[PDB]
Amino acid sequence: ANAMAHMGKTLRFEIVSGVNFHTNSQSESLDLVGGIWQKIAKEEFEKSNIYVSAVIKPSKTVYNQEWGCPENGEETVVLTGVANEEFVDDIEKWKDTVIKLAKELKNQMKQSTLTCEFIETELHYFK
Amino acid sequence: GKTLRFEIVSGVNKGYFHTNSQSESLDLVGGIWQKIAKEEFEKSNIYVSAVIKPSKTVYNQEWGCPENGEETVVLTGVANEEFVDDIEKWKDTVIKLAKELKNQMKQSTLTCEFIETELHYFK
Amino acid sequence: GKTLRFEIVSGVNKGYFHTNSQSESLDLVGGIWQKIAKEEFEKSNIYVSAVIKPSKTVYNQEWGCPENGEETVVLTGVANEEFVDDIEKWKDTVIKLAKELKNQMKQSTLTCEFIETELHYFK
């Protein structure tokens, strides 16, 4: 079959959020966060034509119990995405958009704190 | 000294493999990776191990994403200087395996990223 | 504006701890990390938080990997400039904790990687 491959230097983001909502499992909290992210990314895309996709992974975050962490860690989700040159024209505008969406997710999940990191990456995209 | 890690995201193609949970799809992808990595190692003598995580990938429903995201697996590995002599050959091998996984999982698109990393290996 | 993140991959040593699910092995590793980070913080005033993910690691069955991969946990953390003053001291502390985890989990081998990152922290 025919095939295409693109390679370029770009950025990926990674966000960590709590899961706060009456979910009963990591499978259920994955679906919860997935639905919320899908809605906020869609709203942004309608304004700017920039769609910020994310891969979401179940996790627990371990920190000092004296700052409120439960024993053995707090239930969290990790969201990761990339600026794919096929869909993204301007890396600075994309980065600004990711930061905006991170703050909105923090609000929707009613979180006190939230992290968002940018990491340099070499993206190969196969079709 | 620096080296490289790779990360791939793949779908699990329920339409074709008919897994019923994230536990089952994790095992499916784990077994497929094990087989393709072994086949490649027999050809090139380069064995590419991967750490695999369950996930869901959220994109625009108008491009076919299910509500709340598509079931996916994330595969991540590294060029460990204890086992790898030539980084360029390793990178070429990872790209080969990414394409093979895309084929085996019958995926329309697939991503493979390389990230610079400083590996400490304790034995 | 740059800092460092770490990522560790560890086995869960079913031979010794006998966990029955990925949920149970996540809590096991979580509790061990919490205790070793606390003990270190009391000595050095450096607290190393981690986000822990369930996973499997796929390698050659001829080196002892189970079919479809071995149950593992991935631990990832960052040097947050709001809490961390000296990156070299932090990195040394992470290495110490990685070795201690290797000991507590009775692992033959363990990896710890450092990756450059740009951290935004929202309060």
Author numbering:
A (entry chain F): -5 to 14, 18 to 124
B (entry chain A), C (entry chain C): 2 to 124
Any passages from the paper?
Although most signal via cyclic oligoadenylate, an alternative class of signalling molecule SAM-AMP, formed by conjugating ATP and S-adenosylmethionine, was described recently. SAM-AMP activates a trans-membrane effector of the CorA magnesium transporter family to provide anti-phage defence. NrN is replaced by a SAM-AMP lyase in some CorA-associated type III CRISPR systems, including that from Clostridium botulinum.
Each monomer possesses a signature ferredoxin fold (β1-α1-β2-β3-α2-β4), featuring a β-sheet on one side and two α-helices on the other. Comparison of the apo SAM-AMP lyase and in complex with MTA-AMP reveals almost identical structures (root mean square deviation (RMSD) of 0.3 Å over 123 Cα atoms), consistent with the slight conformational change observed in the homologous SAM-lyase (Svi3-3) upon SAM binding. This suggests the proteins essentially have a pre-formed binding site for ligands. Given the proximity of the T-loop to the binding site of MTA-AMP, it is perhaps surprising that there is no significant movement of this upon binding. This residue may serve as a gatekeeper to the binding site, locking the SAM-AMP substrate in position for catalysis.
